[PDB]
Amino acid sequence: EEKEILWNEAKAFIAACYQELGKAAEVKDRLADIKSEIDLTGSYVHTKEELEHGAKMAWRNSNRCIGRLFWNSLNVIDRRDVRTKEEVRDALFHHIETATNNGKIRPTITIFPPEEKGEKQVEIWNHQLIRYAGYESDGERIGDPASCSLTAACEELGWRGERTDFDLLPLIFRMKGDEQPVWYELPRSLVIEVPITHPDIEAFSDLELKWYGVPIISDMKLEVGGIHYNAAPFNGWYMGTEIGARNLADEKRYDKLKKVASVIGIAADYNTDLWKDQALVELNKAVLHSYKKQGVSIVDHHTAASQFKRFEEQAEEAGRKLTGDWTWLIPPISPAATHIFHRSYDNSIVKPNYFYQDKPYE
Amino acid sequence: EEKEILWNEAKAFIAACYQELGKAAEVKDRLADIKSEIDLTGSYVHTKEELEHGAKMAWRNSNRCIGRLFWNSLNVIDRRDVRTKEEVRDALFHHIETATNNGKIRPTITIFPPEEKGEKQVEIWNHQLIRYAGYESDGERIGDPASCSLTAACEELGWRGERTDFDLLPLIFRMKGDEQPVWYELPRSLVIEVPITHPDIEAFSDLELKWYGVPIISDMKLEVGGIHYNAAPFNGWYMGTEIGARNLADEKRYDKLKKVASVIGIAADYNTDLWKDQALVELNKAVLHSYKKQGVSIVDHHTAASQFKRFEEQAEEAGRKLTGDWTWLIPPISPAATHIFHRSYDNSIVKPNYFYQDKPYE
Ligand code: HEM
Ligand code: HEM
Ligand SMILES: CCN(CCc1ccc(NC(=N)c2cccs2)cc1)Cc1cccc(NC(=N)c2cccs2)c1
Ligand SMILES: CCN(CCc1ccc(NC(=N)c2cccs2)cc1)Cc1cccc(NC(=N)c2cccs2)c1
Ligand SMILES: C[C@H](O)[C@H](O)[C@H]1CNc2nc(N)[nH]c(=O)c2N1
Ligand SMILES: C[C@H](O)[C@H](O)[C@H]1CNc2nc(N)[nH]c(=O)c2N1
Ligand SMILES: [Cl-]
Ligand SMILES: [Cl-]
């Protein structure tokens, strides 16, 4: 049944992939090599081309992603060769560097060896490669609550955060054969951060807000033709609302709106004043302004929505069925101002794709 | 099969309804009377109590409605007695008057005779009892585009709009036996309207915006225990975003955001300025301010969301399953600022309920 799932998935991916790459006549032969390889080894190894296009396809199939227009230009780094934690660390360091690209962010994925018998070769603990720690000690909240459990797990392994609101978590990951993960402090010279200022309102800097430049998701499983790449960190750039409307605004995150309201000089007393909405808008304007001023790639939700419309059009133009999760595609501010809000999407799961997988801690 | 659908629906409604009304011991007897009545007449007639509670239940079951907390206080007017168009008109006029209640809006439903063999007794053409007309003549857009087809149909029947942006449509409805509907101009003394001004920004009145006080939906079918009340106009008060974020903001509606941006003194040139979002917020603040200043009931989306949370809690407290349509429950501005955004809802259809039905024109 396992070998059969793998074989079925492989036939479907190879046929589709080679169709897209104009390699349709190589399918029969390639499928044979695969079937022998599976019968002999219990698995199979992707060609560079297959792996690259699989990564792109997987992005194209991400129902929740609004930034899919640029799926075909994903920069793919093949690190299936790594065997050592030094090699894993250096590959991660490198991913940060080349993705960041001095602020001109390059959408990049680094692909590590896949699971074998469901056995991971490399198991990454970070949610993102760059993320802030979180502390909840008897009433005292510091930093990013989202990171509380990972931060605690890391503080078991001999690490210690400074307990500012913006401690960078180290890389933490475990190698097959090892009982505990290792951790490595990030070289600060690799991490670009952006101070949040506002274009009109001088006092906004009193909040002393900042965010990191590059969101690099490192806890999702890339699935390509039956092969499970549990360790395959990927990055794009931010949509502004992600920082301004969620990370800095959520009560369960940094919870800044009341402070935003105060520094922008409005009362936060009455629901009917719509102070939350007003604070949300200024904070999000601040975010967009700050990233642009700092030479760090970012997109506003109107432009993003506008780009995603082009993606919908391209799919139709290419005869590809379009899938999407409406509940995640709509931006958390002014959703009815985008076309997404006014149409529906089929939320069917298509592979290749990126999937959630169990956290290795907690 | 028809009589069987009716009988099944009736058993389910009577049992549930009488359970809620502490009348559980009357179910067996009441069900018998119903079964005889159906076998003899092909239908059955609701008691006043049944009809009233059915109307309330139907509201409680409206997955898309955020205002459901107040379901049990719905004011029900039983007009199953009407036979003439004069009687229908007067019942509609009256509904407007008592619902409006000088601005202190009373959630009210007026229930007309139900369909017999799927044959309507009274067929209402209006979407709402109070609504603005719409004209689209070679490039020239006037009024509310949503009302274009109904306005045209009405202008077949000898009526003529003045072609302002805010022409009130007359009541239009048809009686069983008649080939054409009749129409009646609304007495202006019955219609409260609100000029949109802004609390801080004097120039906002230059836009010369207004909206009507009371939204009275008059084109949905109320279904209670197998009985189809196709004609049963109902009203609540407005949630501010309905006017500020949709009716006045939608490009396919009044499309005012660029004009809002100009009178509030911001540029409407760059997506990254978030001028749409900023314009949305000021316009919605204007709406809330204007309705409150005029002594007309309205609710902001935070308070509404807050009330709907209490409704969720009540359902649980009463052992009632809760149903909801997440895509409609989230407000079109700052949705992530409400709890609704951060949970899920079962979108199952439960009866009694209000349903769409085919437009009689177009
Ligand atoms: C190029 C810029 C990109 C932008 C602006 C963008 C935007 C977004 C946003 C706003 C979300 C929702 C995130 C949230 O609410 O937490 C999202 C989700 C997602 N994006 Fe993208 N994205 C981009 C590139 C990419 C890339 C390069 C990949 C992978 C190759 C990707 C795959 C995904 C996936 C898998 C999700 C779903 C995550 C989940 O389910 O939690 N995106 N994207
Ligand atoms: C008391 C104040 C009320 C408020 C503030 C309220 C709020 C809302 C809002 C904002 C919507 C979405 C409308 C849209 O986006 O077009 C809605 C939908 C709805 N409401 Fe309510 N509502 C109220 C009372 C009522 C009453 C009295 C009824 C009926 C007895 C009702 C039944 C419904 C139904 C059936 C829908 C769905 C309409 C559709 O599918 O298009 N509501 N409500
Ligand atoms: C933090 C919010 N999301 C992920 C949301 C999420 C993911 C996974 C879980 N799973 C859980 N185990 C938990 C749920 C609740 C507590 S833990 C919960 C939430 C991060 C994210 C994902 C994908 C894209 C982006 N934004 C981006 N622009 C990109 C990053 C990388 C490429 S594009 C952000
Ligand atoms: C105009 C927007 N909605 C209804 C949305 C809608 C309904 C029905 C259709 N059906 C169609 N036939 C069409 C679709 C497209 C063109 S016509 C389309 C849209 C009006 C509405 C419905 C229910 C509640 C409210 N708001 C209110 N606060 C209340 C009114 C009455 C009681 S509460 C507003
Ligand atoms: C319950 C709800 O579906 C869920 O909380 C979603 C709503 N849509 C979202 N959309 C995005 N982009 N990100 C999120 O975290 C959420 N939360
Ligand atoms: C396609 C989408 O589901 C649809 O256009 C909905 C979204 N949610 C909505 N919610 C409300 N309250 N009103 C609407 O008109 C819509 N439009
Ligand atoms: Cl993030
Ligand atoms: Cl409306």
* Domain containing residue A70: CATH number: 3.90.340.10
Cα separations (Å) of B53 from A304, B7, B26, B63, B353?
Answer: 47, 19, 16, 18, 12
d(CA B96, CA B191): 8
Looking at the fold, whether B290 and B270 belong to one and the same domain comes out as yes
Same domain, A43 and A93: no
Give CA separation, A333 vs A282, B161, B285, in Å: 12, 37, 16
Together in a domain, A266 and A325: no
Q: A337 to chain B: which residues are within 8 Å by CB? A: 249, 257, 276-277, 280
Residue B48 lies in a domain: yes
Question: Which residue numbers of B have CB closer than 8 Å to A's CBs?
Answer: 245-246, 249-250, 257, 271-274, 276-278, 280-281, 284-285, 288-289, 292, 300, 302-303, 306, 326-327, 330, 332-337, 341
**A14 and A29 in a common domain:** yes
Residue A129 to chain B, least CA–CA distance (Å): 25
Task: Answer whether residue B145 is part of any domain.
Answer: yes
Q: Amino acid identity, residue A193?
A: E
Is omega for the bond preceding B113 within 30 degrees of 0, making it cis? no
Q: Which residue has the tokens 């965010």?
A: A211
Exposed, middle or buried, B186 (CB in 10 Å: 0-12/13-18/19+)?
middle
Looking at the fold, whether B253 and B225 belong to one and the same domain comes out as: no
Q: Are residues A291 and A276 in the same domain?
A: yes
Tally Cβ neighbours within 10 Å of residue A305. 23
Q: Give CA–CA dist A61/A350, Å, rounded.
A: 6
CA A293-A299-A302 angle, 5° bins:
125
Q: Please give the span between the terminal C-alpha atoms of chain B, in angstroms, as a whole number.
A: 31
| Angstrom distance (rounded) from CA B209 to CA B204 | 9
Helical segments of A208-297, H only: 240-241, 257-263, 275-293
φ and ψ at residue B210, rounded to 5 degrees: -155, 165
As for how many domains chain B has, the answer is 3
Rg for chain B (alpha carbons), in Å?
A: 22
Is B336 in Cβ contact with A245 (below 8 Å)?
Answer: yes
| Residue A35, both tokens | 């079937």
Residue with tokens 């309705």: B291
- How far is residue B56's CA from residue A274's CA, in Å, rounded to a whole number? 31
Q: Is residue B339 part of a domain?
A: no
> Do both A60 and A37 map to the same domain?
yes
CATH code, A254: 3.90.1230.10
Same domain, B208 and B295: yes
Tell me the C-alpha distance between A65 and A118, whole Å. 27
Phi and psi angles of residue A235, each rounded to the nearest 5 degrees, phi first: -145, 150
Cβ separation of B274 and A285 shorter than 8 Å? yes
Best of B269, B274, B278 to mutate (most A CBs within 10 Å, chain A): B274
Q: From ligand 3's centre to the CA of A338, what distance in Å?
A: 22
Q: Which of B281, B326, B327 sits opposite A277 (nearest CB)?
A: B281
Domain-embedded: residue B342 = no
Residues of A with a known catalytic role:
65, 68, 237, 242
Q: Quick check: B277 and A333 CB within 8 A? A: yes
Distance CA B242, CA B229 (A): 26
| B125 within 8 A of B109, measured Cβ to Cβ | no
State whether B54 and B137 are in the same domain: no
Answer whether B342 contacts ligand 5 (Cβ < 6 A): yes
**Could you give the CA distance from residue A187 to residue A170 in angstroms, rounded to a whole number?**
9
Identify which of A357, A38, A354 has the alpha carbon closest to the alpha carbon of residue A223.
A354
Q: Which residues is B235 bridged to in the sheet?
A: B108, B216
Rounded CA separation A74/A235 (Å): 9
- State the burial class of residue B199 (Cβ atoms within 10 Å of its Cβ: 0-12, 13-18, 19+): middle
User: Ligand 5 center to residue A324 CA distance, Å?
Assistant: 13
Provide CB contacts within 8 A for A205, sequence distance 6+.
A195, A196, A197, A198
Whether B17 has a binding-site annotation, put simply, is no
What is the spatial distance between Cα A309 and Cα A319, in angstroms, rounded to a whole number?
A: 16
Is B312 inside a domain boundary?
yes
Which tokens go with B213? 């006080």
Domain that holds residue B35: 1-80+107-117+221-235+305-329
Q: Which of A341, A344, A346, A347 to mutate to test the pocket of ligand 6 (most atoms within 8 A of CB)?
A: A341
Tell me the C-alpha distance between A150 and A143, whole Å: 13
Q: Alpha-carbon distance B340 to B190, whole Å?
A: 36
Q: Are residues B68 and B28 in the same domain?
A: yes
Residues in chain A: 362
Which atom in ligand 1 lies closest to the alpha carbon of residue A58?
Answer: 30
Contacts (Cβ under 8 Å, ≥6 apart) of B83: none
Resolution in A: 2.4
Alpha helices per DSSP H over chain B: 2-20, 27-41, 48-60, 85-100, 148-154, 240-241, 257-263, 275-293, 301-317, 326-329
C-alpha B271 to ligand 6 mean position (Å): 23
Question: In this structure, are strands A182-184 and A171-175 parallel, antiparallel, or unpaired?
Answer: antiparallel
Whose Cα sits closest to atom 11 in ligand 5?
Answer: A328
A197 part of a folded domain: yes
Identify whether B344 is part of a domain.
Answer: no
Q: Which atom of ligand 2 is nearest to the CA of B246?
A: 15
Task: Please give, rounded to a whole number of angstroms, the shortest distance from the CA of B21 to a CA of chain A.
Answer: 36
Those residues with Cβ within 8 angstroms of residue A95's Cβ, 6 or more apart along the chain or in another chain: A77, A108, A110, A129, A216, A233, A235
CA A112 to chain centre: 16
Experimental technique of record: X-ray
Residue A346: inside a domain: no
Distance of residue B248 Cα from the nearest chain A Cα, in angstroms: 12
DSSP conformation letters of B41-90: HSS----HHHHHHHHHHHHHT-TT-TTGGGGGG-EEEE-TT--SHHHHHH
DSSP A44: -
For residue B345 and ligand 5, the question of a CB distance below 6 A is answered with no
Same domain, A167 and A206: no
**Residues of B catalogued as catalytic:** 65, 68, 237, 242
CB contact under 8 Å between A281 and B285, yes or no, is no
Helices (H), B101-154: 148-154
- What CATH number is attached to the domain comprising A171? 3.90.440.10
Distance CA(A290)–CA(A167), nearest Å, equals 20
Residue B89 structure tokens:
């008109």
From residue A71, alpha-carbon distances to A54, A60, A235, A325 in Å are 11, 6, 12, 17
Amino acid at B37: E
Cα A329 to averaged position of ligand 5 atoms, centre (Å): 9
Pair (B204, B290) in one structural domain: yes
